Each structure stands twice: as structure tokens, then as C-alpha cells.
Amino acid sequence: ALHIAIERRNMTLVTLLVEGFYFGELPLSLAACTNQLAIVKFLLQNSARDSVGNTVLHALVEVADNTVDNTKFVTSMYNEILILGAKLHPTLKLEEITNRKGLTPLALAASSGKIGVLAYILQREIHEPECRHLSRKFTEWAYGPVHSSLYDLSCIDTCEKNSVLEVIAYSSSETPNRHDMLLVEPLNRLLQDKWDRFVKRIFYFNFFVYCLYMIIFTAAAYYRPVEGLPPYKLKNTVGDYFRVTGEILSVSGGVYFFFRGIQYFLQRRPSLKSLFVDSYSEILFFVQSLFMLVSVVLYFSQRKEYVASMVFSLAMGWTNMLYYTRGFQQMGIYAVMIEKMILRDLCRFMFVYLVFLFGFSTAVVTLIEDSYNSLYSTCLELFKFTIGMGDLEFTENYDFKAVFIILLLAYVILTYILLLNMLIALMGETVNKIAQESKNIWKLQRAITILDTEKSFLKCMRKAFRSGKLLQVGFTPDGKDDYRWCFRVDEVNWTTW
Amino acid sequence: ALHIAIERRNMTLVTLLVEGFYFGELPLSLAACTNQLAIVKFLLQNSARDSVGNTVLHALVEVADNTVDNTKFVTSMYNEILILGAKLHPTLKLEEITNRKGLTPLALAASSGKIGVLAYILQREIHEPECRHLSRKFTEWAYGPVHSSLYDLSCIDTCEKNSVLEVIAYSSSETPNRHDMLLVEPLNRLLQDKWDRFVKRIFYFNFFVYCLYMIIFTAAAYYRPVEGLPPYKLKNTVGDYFRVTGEILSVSGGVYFFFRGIQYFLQRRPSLKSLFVDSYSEILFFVQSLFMLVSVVLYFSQRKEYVASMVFSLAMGWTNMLYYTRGFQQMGIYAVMIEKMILRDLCRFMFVYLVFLFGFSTAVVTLIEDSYNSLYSTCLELFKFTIGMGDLEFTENYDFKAVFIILLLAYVILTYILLLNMLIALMGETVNKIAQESKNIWKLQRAITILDTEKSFLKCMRKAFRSGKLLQVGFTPDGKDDYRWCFRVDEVNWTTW
Amino acid sequence: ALHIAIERRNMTLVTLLVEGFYFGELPLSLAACTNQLAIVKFLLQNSARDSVGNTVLHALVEVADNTVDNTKFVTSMYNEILILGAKLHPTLKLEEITNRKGLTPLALAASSGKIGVLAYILQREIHEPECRHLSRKFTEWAYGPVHSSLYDLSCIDTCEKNSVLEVIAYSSSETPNRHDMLLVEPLNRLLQDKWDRFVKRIFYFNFFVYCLYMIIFTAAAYYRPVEGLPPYKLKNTVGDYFRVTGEILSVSGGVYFFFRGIQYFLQRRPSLKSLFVDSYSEILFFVQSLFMLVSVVLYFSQRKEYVASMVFSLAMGWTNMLYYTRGFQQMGIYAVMIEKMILRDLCRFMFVYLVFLFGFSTAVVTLIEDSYNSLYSTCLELFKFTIGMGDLEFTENYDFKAVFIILLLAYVILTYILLLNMLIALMGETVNKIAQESKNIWKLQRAITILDTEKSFLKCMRKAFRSGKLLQVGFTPDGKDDYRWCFRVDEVNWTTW
Amino acid sequence: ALHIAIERRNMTLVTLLVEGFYFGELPLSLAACTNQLAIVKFLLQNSARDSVGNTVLHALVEVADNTVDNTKFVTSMYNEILILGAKLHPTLKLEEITNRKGLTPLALAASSGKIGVLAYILQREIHEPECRHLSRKFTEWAYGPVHSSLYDLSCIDTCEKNSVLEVIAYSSSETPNRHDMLLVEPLNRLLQDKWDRFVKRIFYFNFFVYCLYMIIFTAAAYYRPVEGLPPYKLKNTVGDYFRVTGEILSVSGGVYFFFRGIQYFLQRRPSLKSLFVDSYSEILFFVQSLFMLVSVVLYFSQRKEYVASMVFSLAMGWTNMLYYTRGFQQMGIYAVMIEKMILRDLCRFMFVYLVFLFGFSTAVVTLIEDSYNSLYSTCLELFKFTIGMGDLEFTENYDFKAVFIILLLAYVILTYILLLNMLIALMGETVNKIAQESKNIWKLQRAITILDTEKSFLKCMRKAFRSGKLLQVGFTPDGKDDYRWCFRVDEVNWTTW
Ligand SMILES: COc1cc(CNC(=O)CCCC/C=C/C(C)C)ccc1O
Numbered sequence A, B, C, D: 001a002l003h004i005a006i007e008r009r010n011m012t013l014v015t016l017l018v019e020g021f022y023f024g025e026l027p028l029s030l031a032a033c034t035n036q037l038a039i040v041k042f043l044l045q046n047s048a049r050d051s052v053g054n055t056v057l058h059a060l061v062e063v064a065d066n067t068v069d070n071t072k073f074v075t076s077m078y079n080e081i082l083i084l085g086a087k088l089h090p091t092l093k094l095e096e097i098t099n100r101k102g103l104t105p106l107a108l109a110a111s112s113g114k115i116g117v118l119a120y121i122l123q124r125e126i127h128e129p130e131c132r133h134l135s136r137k138f139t140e141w142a143y144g145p146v147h148s149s150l151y152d153l154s155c156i157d158t159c160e161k162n163s164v165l166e167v168i169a170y171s172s173s174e175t176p177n178r179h180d181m182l183l184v185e186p187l188n189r190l191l192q193d194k195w196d197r198f199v200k201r202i203f204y205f206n207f208f209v210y211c212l213y214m215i216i217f218t219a220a221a222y223y224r225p226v227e228g229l230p231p232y233k234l235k236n237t238v239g240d241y242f243r244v245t246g247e248i249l250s251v252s253g254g255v256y257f258f259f260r261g262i263q264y265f266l267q268r269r270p271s272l273k274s275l276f277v278d279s280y281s282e283i284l285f286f287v288q289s290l291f292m293l294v295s296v297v298l299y300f301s302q303r304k305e306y307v308a309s310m311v312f313s314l315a316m317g318w319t320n321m322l323y324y325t326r327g328f329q330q331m332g333i334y335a336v337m338i339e340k341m342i343l344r345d346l347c348r349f350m351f352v353y354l355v356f357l358f359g360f361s362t363a364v365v366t367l368i369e370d371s372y373n374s375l376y377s378t379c380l381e382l383f384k385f386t387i388g389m390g391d392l393e394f395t396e397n398y399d400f401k402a403v404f405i406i407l408l409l410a411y412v413i414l415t416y417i418l419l420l421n422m423l424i425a426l427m428g429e430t431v432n433k434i435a436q437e438s439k440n441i442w443k444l445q446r447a448i449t450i451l452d453t454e455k456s457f458l459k460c461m462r463k464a465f466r467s468g469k470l471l472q473v474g475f476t477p478d479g480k481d482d483y484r485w486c487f488r489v490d491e492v493n494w495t496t497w
């Protein structure tokens, strides 16, 4: 009755009565979510939590499609509902109420990834002195066409459970707007300010330390003993001393990266199904650590097979230096494109190319009578065509010339001239598509680095720098108390006047 | 008189009289096809089949150009004519009348490929209780802005001769909209539902069985006897037993694919002129079967030349595994692009490159005096330049150094640096063009697989699943009887309200 | 006075008086060219040739900028002036008057390349019976929305000196619209009709004959005598007879192409500055003929150096078969792109690459002490890097390892990885730009082939086919005589009604 | 009070009182910069230099954002202020006042790079005889729709300290519009006129002289003595005489380029941080000179290591010939693209590729036991994969086959197939982006060449040609004196009428 009549958008029906689409589980949520501006007014004058913990604000954000009209009336109705909550209940902070997951409506908007409501809440301001405390953005002053704005940033830096910026950064990448979500003024300028302030220096110190670690590890690997099986007994030579110091430093760094990989996985707890896409760099750093530890295990197991794992660790550590080039803007896009291919284009192309290579490998191997008769050897001899180093007659031990050479021509036309250039065209398309995208994936993960660095910060460095500035605000009618950690930012728009 | 006056769009002329462009062969067809809304009303109040079997509805669809205004008034006039048929003759189902080809007007629209009238008929609904049975789309209910729609789907799943979806899928690809024709709501959701329901499992079972067949066939080919001429006498060794089992299984699969190719060609009966373009995969599977059967023939003919055909079958079977990757969405586009090149770009480029290669091959061969003097050998030595493995002096047995080396430089500049990169640029253009196209060619052939799988389904599996759901409809004035196999689908549009 | 006042666009000034921009050299030309609709009326009521032979129509076409407003009022004023010429002088055919160059105003519009006035004159029609003969386009009839139009085509097929289509086709390519100029209805359909009618068959007969000539010439070249110096004495063997027949046929074709090149150059007389751009194919065919004749000269000069020229002719003849692939639509674009590169991109890239190659060649040669010390040999060894067949240590006879290997690395980075891929990117840009352009350059030169084929046609084949159809037209008031060679074409536009 | 009230845009506040954003440091600058059209009128009726030397005009240009509305009202208010300066003070030339840097407001606009105000001042004209001298553009006459305009060009050719064109050309490339800034009519036509007039001939003479110098230097290098250590004693042979002449000419050119590099660096004094980006060609010419001088030093130091530096100079001189190809239009874009890559794409890709190459080099070297064991040798053997000349088994001296070959496959997939094609895609994107940009970077540096050539011109050639023409102008009310070096240019716009 109430549900059907309210959903009918009939004011008369609601006035007469009261006197799988998810829209909340209470009448207020239905009325608000259905664009009923006046019906909610009557229902209030004729902050509830539903069975899922979602209040009317949660039902508002849950329904928004992020489109222009959706964002328009959703923001408007959010404002009206929050005002009537203000006038009827000034002291109540309806936003503080959280669902089962524990997110506030702003945090819910960030989690789901709707930039409309997010930007509205971020830039919100209410002139009316009826509820002056209820404004997110405070305008400091204007001298000419200049405007020095302030933004509240209550839970954007460090909240009770999850801050807004944390949720944006640690999104599983299924959230659509994620990169664009950082473009909004307060978050963007806050990120750049934190980066320039102190996190830049720590990041370069980390980068230099990692370079130093990799250089000493490369030296210690290069000059490994070649006599006998390990472990090789310590010698009194200065070279021996430097070498044992290099090995112990390298394995210390290895276990360090191992523990950091574990603790990252525990903190984030990402889905194993989407482990690669969200976190590519961490997997590689962890696997480098794992190769180092496996190498140490095989080393003290009295096996010569330790150099196999150690060499993989050495190569992968150098090829993991790109992670630091995401600290810059110019190089970070470049590395992001390598991540995108190795995740998307290169696995595709490898499965297809392996179908082709294996088909023609088995074909030529069965054709050859019989030394290139090991299916491995023929696979290599057919792979050497892709690198432009193969030859049309690697063998002469076939009964049939026409069949063999036809097989090789068909393979070369299929892979060297056709598949490989399909990959060239596809990576051209990828660069064309993501020339704009990578510019903000870079920012997104630059934000992840900032959050990781500040999280791994002790009391002294964290107390020495907190975001924004603690500034008093408009006193509330309940107790004349409103002081917040508000950030400050400038702006000059001529049309503002 | 009637024809000329009616075509003049003069209501007065028709009222006075009655009282190579194909527009139907009766006055009603001319009046309807010429946008004469009122003239047809008088002609009715002042369902015929013409000499070609085309009724007024057939003349309507035949005339539509599928453009915005054409579709607009064609759909409108179709509605008006069908309503007047309803009021004057409620019991008559004018659409059931078919032309000589046997297609209904909806089937005719699908065959010709006009998405305008097709989408109109697919989404048609008539509120008026004057003829309530005459609505294609039935709205189940609406709780809020939710709308649970139902679509009739009379002949879209299994009709008397040809269903709508069958005609869309088995189109010769000359029909323009074919891919877009599957995007329309009922067909699209019906396809995805059928795929997810049961056809997905059968397709993966088929894919795994094909992989198993190819692996056992690869093993049986690899370990073929190398002693003497065939047939090789059975041995009591376990290896001999496994090998004979592998050979008999491989040839059984070969004859299976042979028969399936034949029966496909009989069912579809495609034009030999356009055999490749419409059906690329079937040709390859059939030719693999043909190579296997030729190999068996040469095997029991006591010839050593069986391995030639068997090896071609083995290679082509592996390279035909891409057909299954059209079952996925990510990989199917990739395989479709290979089909597109081998049909369009690669034949072009091969004819041109063969002109160039043969010209410079004959040039260098006539220049050489004389061992590279076989026109085959020089062709290979000039082909090795394309793969980046050739050399500017493969021979020294020429009287003229300048002429020979000039020929080679001109060839390399013409083919390696210029033609081959024209192919690179062309495939870049192809990917740029069809990045959107392949996304729906994939769907189109995914639909072909679904239809093929359901067609090759016995009574039990077909009766266990029929599309849509049998639900009663608005009773007709003739006998109060309207029950259809109507599909159900949800939708949420805010502007609908 | 008259000039300044008329150019002032003051009707009062002209009425009072009469009672380096090229705008014609008479008052009427100034008034018409300056948008003075009424002033010309008074000047006529208050067909001259100027010192350059340009009438008012010539001054009209000379001034048009081909833009939307320019074409609009130019076409309008052309119509008004031509009508007033009609009423004041019905018998006069003002268009027949020609300038010094001999072009009529329509021919002048075609020569200068303004598609606006050209399309207007091509599609012109005048309903008014005041001058019914003065309409270019005659509407045959309309049955429904069908319209069977007729176009006059007086001088479009075969005029006194230069036909319209001839001027469009033989344009020096500086004319901007040239390709688009053939898209206009009468010319386009006339071209396609002539092609399908008889010229298609002659073109394929020519193509097959050329293939036959090249095959017999390839055979005669391949089996040349290798003993002694020429001329080689005739032998009674059947092989000798076939070989002398092949040689005489080949040289006959060579002299044939030589004479055709000469007569083409005399007929067209193109500028030597722009000889390549306008006529690429003719230069190559002529040079093949020239190589054959030089080979015959050296052959009968008792020199073994005839095979050098003959081999160049043999290679270039095969590589000239692309000219026939411009007869098709699919392959013609492909060949046109090769023409475009060899004219534009490849000369650019060769000059730059030769600067680089010569710089590093001389560098490495001076570095080497000393066998790779011939500047030719080092140039080849550095060219072999581009084809992916070079090696970083081709020699060891250098005093300095670091300098030599640095030179080679710098060269490889500069040419193999950077210049060569600049060429790849540039040809990608070229294909991207001209994917649409080539589609109509093909048509343009397909038109050139049609004109060449019909020009080289005797009385019988020309009288057996003349374009259009001789049909009587609206009788003129002067003598009631108007019969023209009018072409016929259909059209169906719904908005026409 | 005055500042705040004026910035409030309240005319009443200013009338009542009077009776880090940079907007000038005086009330007039604030009123003008804030769009207060009327307030400045009162302030004048109720040419100051501020502490930074910026007058109201400087404050106007400093504030413009170059956007459509910004340029609109900035140009309008500039006109109004300059007129009121005219009426109140006709004799005063407010523009002549300069800031501390010495730039006039036009020069300031050019320096900052705002094309709006620049184009306005360049094309300015004032019809009103109230101040007729105050018009930049003078219209010579109009015969029909023709208009022969004149532009003043006071300080555009040769001013007191810095001309307008000089500032545009010598911009540090941080100025955004720089290329577009030369497109404006007077500057563009003035550049092309100067180029065609005399600078073209001098540039070709310089190009031919440089080619001659490089050829004689190449010859003198090629035939260097190979016996003993330098200096090689003079011989009486004619070859010895030509060789000493070649060496002395080559070193004379070397010192010439050295001095020109020094004097360029002194005149321009560009920032060492952005030395490459603004001036790529000069660095290369200077470094060629430096290599030649180092070679002479090592030559007279009795060392055989002179050929190392001389060979680098020889190679780099040839590869520096591209600088002259920026004199043409077709080739200049081509060379500019090489500059852009070697500055932007190639350093990026080299740092990443060096990370990868070094990682896998150290990996394979530590894996190898041990001749390819020098880390240099393995780096070369892994670089040879990029050029398509490497091989998967260059060595067999490894204990582990799987690990080694896995390392090589991973490297080849990472660099040859993935990184190198990321570079191909990136350079494709670069060409796509700058196909339009390079067309005007070419013009920009062609302007730099013109300015350099005229600057290095004596009294005779400079007095023989000065830009524009000295023509009298509208006499000023102060002393009836206005004569300027005004340039002349034609134009034909139909809409002008
Ligand atoms: C089987 O269906 C498909 C297959 C493919 C890829 N496979 C091919 O293109 C086969 C080409 C022929 C290669 C045979 C070589 C022999 C002579 C050694 C793409 C799309 C499909 O639908």
C-alpha cells in the first residue's frame, strides 16, 4: 500500500494513506530514491537504519547511475534531505551512520565509484546561516576575482576505519571512475601537496637505497664461487669478506621484500581471481623475494642449483626497477603501458602464437624422419623465425622437400608476417586508446605509493605532518562547536566575478 | 489510371476514379508504399497476394531504405495498416501469409536486413483494447521505475520453416546490418540466456573433446613407423596397440569432420562464389578432414606419401583450434581479425608481392650465368630478404656486379622496406576500422554456434529447454484465445517514470 | 568612373553615370562579378569578348572560390545572366564563345577545377517555357517517387577541341577537386557505363596480351645463349627457332611501348618539372621500352653488356604489371599507394638515410686502418643493418674498439631503430590520410584509361558506340530545333515526392 | 579602501570614496584589470609606472588568459584606455614606456606569449579622426572587393632593444603559442618576403659552402697518413699539398664553428637546464667543432688517438646536414621529427631498455660459468637480438640449459617483441600528434635562421634592404608628424564588401 502508492509518484495517494531493484527497505528510502521531493517532506512532518544498515543516504548513493540527470537530481535531493535533517535535527550528523561494511555515505560513494555524488559532497557548501556548520567547503576570502577556498576534509585524510582517499586508491579497479575520482579539486591538490612536502624525499631515498641494494647484489652474484658445491667456506681474503657481506645484505633485502609482500597481501587481501590486474608490481617484488629465499634454501641444501633461482631473482630485480619510474610522470606512463600489455595483449598473443608454433612444430617433427628431431629443437628452430634469425633450411633430413618447405612458408606467413603484425597493430591500438588513460593510472598508483609511505610512518613523522590545517568553523546551534582539519586552495575564475 | 492517380498523391483523384521500381503489384501496395495514409483507408472502406506472393506488408518492407525518416513512416504506416486489418478482420493473422520464398514479413525484414522494421516488430506493443492480442511486447508490471517487459517471440525460436534468428545468423553477409541486427533486446538477451543455460557446457565439452582428439592424433602421428612402406603390420607390443588405437581414433575423427562438412554444405548450400567469406572455419575443418582421408587412402595404397597429407592435416588441425576461441569474447575478436586478413589483406598483398618477387627472381636468374640458378632457388633467396635472413651476396657467379647488386637493392627497397610496410600500415588501418566491428562479428558467429548446437540436439535435450516461457496473453475477439511462448526481460529507465 | 562607381555597389551611381584582381576587362564583367544583380539588368537594358577572350561567363568562373556562398551566388548570377541573354537573344548560344585557350565556360570551369559551377552546369535545368531549350537536364518522367532524368551532355563526350571529361582527366593534378570532379552524377554514371559496355573487355584483352608478352619475353630472356659474344648465330634446332621468335616478339613489344610513350608525351605534353607526379606509369613503361632498345643496340654492337639492360627491362616489366591492377577497384588503391610512396615518402627518406649512411660509412672507413676498406664495401656492410642482416663486428682491423663500436651503435640507433621507424610511422600516416583519397584517384586514372582506349579506336568501334542517346529536345524559339546526345539515368529520392 | 572597493566592482563605492594575484600595483591597474570600464573613466577624469615598471598596459597583458572572453574584453579595454590616453594626452606614446626588463607592452605580450593581444595590436586600426595617428593598420585602398592594407611595423623589424619578431623567435619554447604566434598576417608575410627577397640566396650559398667543406674534409680525413705517430711531416708530393690544404681548411671550419657556438651562447644565454630542447642544432654543430679541436690537440700532442675524435667529428658533420633541410618545407618537418624523438622518446626508451638489457646481461653472465663472460660481451650478444641478428645459443658454456634459454626467451619477448614495439607505437603516436605541429615548428626555426642571417649582416646589405616601406601616415595633433616603416599586403574577402 505505502510502497506501491509511493512508487506511483502520487502525492494524493500518500496523503490519503498515511493520514529485483534495490531502493532501500523503508518508506523514506523509497520516497527519496524515486524523486519524490514533496512526499519525503510530508513523511518527515506528517536517520533510520534498514536490515542492511543502509540509511536514506545509502539508498540515494546506491541508486545513482552517475549520469548527468541522475547526478543532478540525486545531488539536489541529497541536499534537500540533509537540510530537512538539519532543521528538524541540527545536532544529528546523519552521515556518521555507517552500514554493516562500516562505510559512511561519502565512503560508500567512493567505494561504489560514483564521481557525481562524490564531487558534490567534496565541493559542497551551504550559504544559509540556518545550518552554517553543514557546509563542506568554506570560502576564506576574495580580494578581486581571486577566491581562497577551504574544504573540510573530515575523513579524507585519517578517519575511524576507512578514509575517502584510501578507498579510492585501494579500489579493486572494477570501480569505473577510479582514476577520474582523484581529479576532483581537494583530493588532487591534497595528493600533490603531500607528495611535494615530504613523501617525495622518502620516495627518492627508497629509490636510491633500492638501486644500491641491487648494485651490491649484482656484484655479490657476479663474483660467486665456482669451485665445488655450496656452501663455500669463508676465506680470510678481503674479497671473501666483501662477498659474504654482499650475500648477507642481499638475502636480508630478500627476506625484507618477502615480509613486505606478505603484509601487503594481509592488509589488502585482494581477490586471487583479480590478483594480477590490481597489483602487478607487488607480485613481481614478492616473487623476486621468493626466488632469493629459494636460492638460499638450495644454497644451504648443498646443491649447485641455487644459481638458477638466484639468477632469476637478479634479472627480475633489475626489471622491477620500473616501479620507481612510476614516481616520475614522464616515465610512469611508459611503465604502465608495459604492465597493460603483459596483462592483456601479450597473454592473448602468446596463446594464439603457441597454438600456431606447436601445430607447425609437431607437423615438421612428424615430417622429419631422422639433429633437429626433438620437439623442443624444432620449436626453437621455428621460434627463431619470429626474431628474424631463422632459416628456411635448418635441416636436410626430410624425405619430402615440397611438404617441408610449404610448411615453413605457411608458418612464416602465418606468424612472422601476419600474427606478429597483428600484435604490432593491437599495441598501436592500445597506445592510441590509453594515451589519456595512463596519464591518470599513473596518478592513481602514485597515490597508492603516498598512502603506503604514510601508513608505514611512525608517530613522530605523522605528527610532524597532518594534512590540511586545524581551523575553527561556523559554530553549530547545538553547542556552538565546529572545528575541522580544513585544507586551503586558491582559484581564479573570471565568470565568478 | 488508378496506378498513376494513386502515385500522384492526390486524394481527390482516387476518390473520383474509384467511386523499374518495385512497390508491389496491386493498388493497395502502391498506396501504402507511397505514404498515402488516407488513400488506403478509403480503398479498404470504399491481405491480397500478388503474382510474387508479396502482400502489402512485403511491399512495405521491400521499400524501406532503413534510414531515419524511411523507418519512421514505414513503421507508422505498417502499424496503421495492421490496425485497420485488425478492426476490419480481427481473426485474420496477415503476417502468417508468406511469399514464394516462404518468409513472413518479419522473416522478410530479417532476410533483407532492415533493422528498422525488424526492431519495430520485435519491440511492438499496442495499448488499445480494440485489439489487445495484436501486441508483440507485453509489459508484466512496474514496481517503481522498474519495468518487467515480456516479448512474444512467436517464430523467433522455432517456426514452421525459418525462424527469425536463424535467418539473421545464416545471412550471406551481404545483408548490411547483420551484426547490429542481433543487438536488439529480445534477440540479444535470448542468445545470452541460451548460451549461459546449457549451450555453454556443451561447447566446452566439445572444445575439450577436440583438444583430446588433437593430442592423441599428434601422439599417433609423432610415433609413426619409419621402416618400410605402409601398411605397417600390427605388433603385439603395448606401443603398437596404443598406436593402432590412436590411428583409428584419428581417422574416425577425420571421417566425422568430413561428414559434418558435407552435411553443413547441404543444409546451408552457400554460393561457391562467396564460400570463403561467409564460412571460413568450416572450409578449414572440412579440408583437414579431406587431408586425413587422402592420407588414409595413400596409406592403404602402399605409398610413403601418406605422411605428406597427414602432416598437413596435423598442422591445420592445431591451427584450427582458434575456432574454439571464438567461444570466448576476448580471444574471439583476435581470431576474427586473422580471418579478415587471410580473406582480404593477405591475398591482395600476396598477389602484389608475387609480382615483385617473380620479376626480380627472373631478373637475377637471367643475369646469373652459372648453385643458385634454379628459378626456385633464386625465389627462395629473394624471399629470405623479407624474413630478415637474406644476404646481399648469396652468389658470386655473375659477370656483372653493379647490375646484380642494383637489382637486389631495388628489390629490398621495393619489398622489404616499402611493400611489407604497406602491409603493416594496412593491417593497422584494418584494426582501426574493425576494432568495433569484430566485437559483434564475434556475437554473430557465437549465435551460429548456438543454432548449430541446438539443431544437432535430440528430443530429450530440446524438450528439456525451450526458449522463453509459455504464458497466456490477451484473449482475441475471434475466440478469446492468445497464448504464446513469451520471453521475459527487465529494464530500468528513469525517463520512463 | 564607371569602374569605380560600379565596384562601389551603388545602383544610384551607375544610373546617374550611364544615363591585381582579375574580374574581366569590361563593365559587364565587373558588374556581374561583384554580385550586382540589378546593375547588369540596367546595363543590358539601359556576349562581349575582352582582350583575353574571356566573356562575362569566363569572368564569372574565374572569380568563384568554390566555397558555399561563392558557389551559391555565382551559380545564381550565372543563371540570371544566362536567362537575360536568353530573353534578349534566344538564338545566341553564349557558352559556345571560347577564350584564346579555346575553352568554353563549362570547359573553363573544368580546367580551373571549381566543382561548384561545374556541378551546377552539369545538373542545370530550367522549367520556364520562356527558354525551354536552355536546360541541361531534362526530366523524362516520374511514375511514383521514381524520376528518370536525362542530361544533355553536349561537349562532355566528344566536342570540337576539348571535351569536359577529357579536361578533367588530363588535369595536371594541381587542380584541387579533380577526383571529386568525377563524382558528379552524369560524368560518374557515364564513365561506369562506358567501362561496363565495351572498354572493360578491351582492357582485359590488353591485360592478357601483356601477360602473354611478358611470359614469352621472360622465357626468351631465361634461355639466352651463354657462349661467346652476341649476336649468336641462328641454329636449326626447334629451341633456336622458338628463341628467335621470342626475341623478335620481345623487341617488337619494346619498340611498340617506345612509340606509345613518345606519342603519349606529344599528345599530353606534360611539364618536365611535374612529369613524375601526373604520369608515373607511363614513365615506367617508356623506360622499360628504352631498356629493351638499349639492349638490342648493345646486342648488335657485339657486346656482352646487353643482358644488363635486358635484365632491367625484364624486372621492370614484371613490376609494371601493377598498372593493370588499377583496372580493378580492390587492387588499384593498393598500387596507387605504392605510387604515392615512391613519389613522396621514399625520396625524402632516402635523402635523409643516405646522409646518415654516408656519414657513418666515411666515419668507419677513415677509422679502419687496413677486406672492408672500400667505401662501397663499408656502405654495404652498414646497409646490411637495415635489413636485419648485419653484424656488430664485420671486421677486426681497427686500432680502436670503443670508437668503432660506438660508431656502429650510434648508426644502428639512428637508422635501424629511429629513421626506419619514422618511415613506418610516416607510411602509417600516409595510409590514414589517403584511405579515402586513393578510392577516387583510382577512379580518376580508370577514366584516363577509358579515354585512352576510346581515343585509340577506329571508325567502326567508335560509330558502334557513342555515349548517351540522340534524343530530340524542346524546340527553340529561333528555329524550333533542339536535338542533343542526351544520357539517361534513374533516381529515387523520397523527399522529392 | 580604494583597492577593496574598486575590486568590489561597485561604481557607487568608488564615487563615494574618491570624491597572490598580480594585477598591477596602482588603483588604475586594478580598475582596468577588473573589467571596470566606467571606473577608470572617473579615475582619469575625477601612464604611471609601478615599482616593477609595469604600466596599466603591462597589467592588462599580464592578466589575459588568452581565452575567447579574456581576449575579447582585454582587447576592448586596452582600446578604451588607449583612446582616453589619446584624447587626454594625444602627444603621449604610452606604449613606449617599458618595464625593468625593457619590453614595451607589445613586446611584453610577445614575450609572455598571448596571441590574442598580440594579434589585436598587430592588426589594430582606428577609423576615428579624433586620433588618426593611433592606428596600427592603414588601409591603402579598395578597388572592388579588393583591399590593399598597410601595417605600421614600428618595432617589429628593428627596435631599440628587442623587436617583436626577435622575442617570438628567441622564446625559450615554454611560451605556448610560439609557432601560432608567427601565423598572424604581418609577421607571416614579412617573414616570407624577407626569405624570398635575399635571405634565400644567402642560405643556399651557406648550404653549398657547408657541403663543399664537408666533402673536402671527408677527403682529407679519408687519405690521412697511416705510418707512424703524428704530426706527419710535409711532403713535396701534390697529394701531400692537397692533403695539408684539406687539413688546414677543415680545422679552419672547425674553429669557425667553435667561435660561432660560443657567440651564439653568449647572445642567447639559454638556460643550461633547457639547453637541448630550445637549441638542438647548435649543440651538435658546437660539439662537432669541439671534436675537431680536440682532434687537432691530440694530433699535435704526438698521439695516434686523434683519429678517434676526428672520426666522430666527420660522422657528426654529415649527420648535421639535416639542419639545412629545415630550409625546405618538405624536408624540414622530417628533420624536426628526428629532433623530437632524440629529445623525448629515445631517452625514455633507452633508460627502460638499458634497465632490461643490463638486468638480463648480469643474469646471463652470473649464470655462465666459463668466450662470452665479459659483461660487455654478453651485453652485446643481447643487443644483437634487437637488430634481428642474435641467436638463441651464442654459447654452450653454461651448466643449466633451461635457466639460460628461459632467460633469453624472456628477454626477447620483453625487449624485441614488446619494448621495441612499444617504441614503434609511441613514435606512431608522436607522428600522429605532431603532423600539424611540425609544420609550424619548421616556420619558427626558419624565422630563427632569417634573424640570425640578418643579424650577421654588415651595413651595406642591411641598408640595401629594410623591411616594409617608409611611408607617411596621419599627422598627429601634437605636431602633425607621423611617418612609419609600414609594410603592405593585399586581401580579398567577399563578406567584407
Ligand atoms: C578453423 O576456424 C578458424 C581458424 C582460424 C585460424 N586458422 C587458419 O587461418 C588456418 C590457415 C591455414 C593454415 C594451414 C597451413 C597448412 C597448409 C600447413 C581463424 C578463424 C577461424 O574461424
Ligand SMILES: COc1cc(CNC(=O)CCCC/C=C/C(C)C)ccc1O
Binding pocket: C406, C407, C410, D280, D281, D282, D284, D285, D312, D315, D316, D319, D320, D321, D322, D323, D335, D336, D338, D339, D342
Ligand atoms: C644539426 O642540426 C640537426 C641535426 C639533426 C640530425 N642529426 C642528429 O641527430 C645528430 C645525432 C648525433 C649523431 C652523432 C653520432 C656520432 C657520435 C658518431 C636533426 C635536426 C637538426 O636541427
